[PDB]
Amino acid sequence: ETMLRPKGFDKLDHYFRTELDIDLTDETIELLLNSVKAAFGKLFYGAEQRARWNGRDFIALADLNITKALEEHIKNFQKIEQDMGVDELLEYIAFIPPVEMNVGEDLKSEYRNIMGGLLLMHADVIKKATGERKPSREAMEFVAQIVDKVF
């Protein structure tokens, strides 16, 4: 790899291998990030309605479709000291939530924790579903499919 590899990939690659026992490639990182981005969009299911019922004109964290299981991953992510590239990866995915309403700035400030939780959740699913320390394209495509069915 060189310094041109998209920013964050480096650090994610390094964290997944050394701390989670998952060997990623550029190809499987892209698949992983597309699945994270998809799941992130799914968290906005019901969010505009919940915001309106609360008298708000913006989406708050309280309005998102986050479950207890994801909340646990988000909390575990916040206690990680090593930088796994989440800030760079967030910019890389160029996330646009599927809503017309304003996303509140305090929620925007939590996007790194949400994405970090989604990354740890995906690592958990990779290990429990693929059977491969170095997942193939098809293994990762399967992870994205089964993740889509819990969001």
By the criterion CB under 5 A, which residues form the site for Zn ion?
Answer: 1, 5, 13, 26, 141
Can you tell me which of 3, 4, 6, 14 binds ligand CAC, judged by CB under 6 A? 14
13 binds ligand CAC (CB under 6 A): yes
Q: Contact between 89 and ligand CAC (CB under 6 A)?
A: no
CB of 98 closer than 8 Å to CB of 54: no
Does 88 interact with ligand CAC (rule: CB under 6 A)?
no
**Residue 81: which of ligand CAC, Zn ion, none does it interact with, CB under 5 to 8 A by kind?**
none
Q: Is 10 in the site for ligand CAC (CB under 6 A)?
A: yes
* Closer residue to Zn ion in complex, CB, 26/71: 26
Alpha-helical (H) ranges within 62-110 are 68-78, 86-93, 105-108
Instruction: Give 1-9's long-range contacts (Cβ < 8 A, gap of 24+).
Output: 6/88, 6/92, 7/85, 7/88, 7/91, 7/92, 8/85, 8/86, 8/87, 8/88, 8/89, 8/92, 9/85, 9/89
When the beta carbons of 3 and 55 are compared against ligand CAC, the nearer one is 3
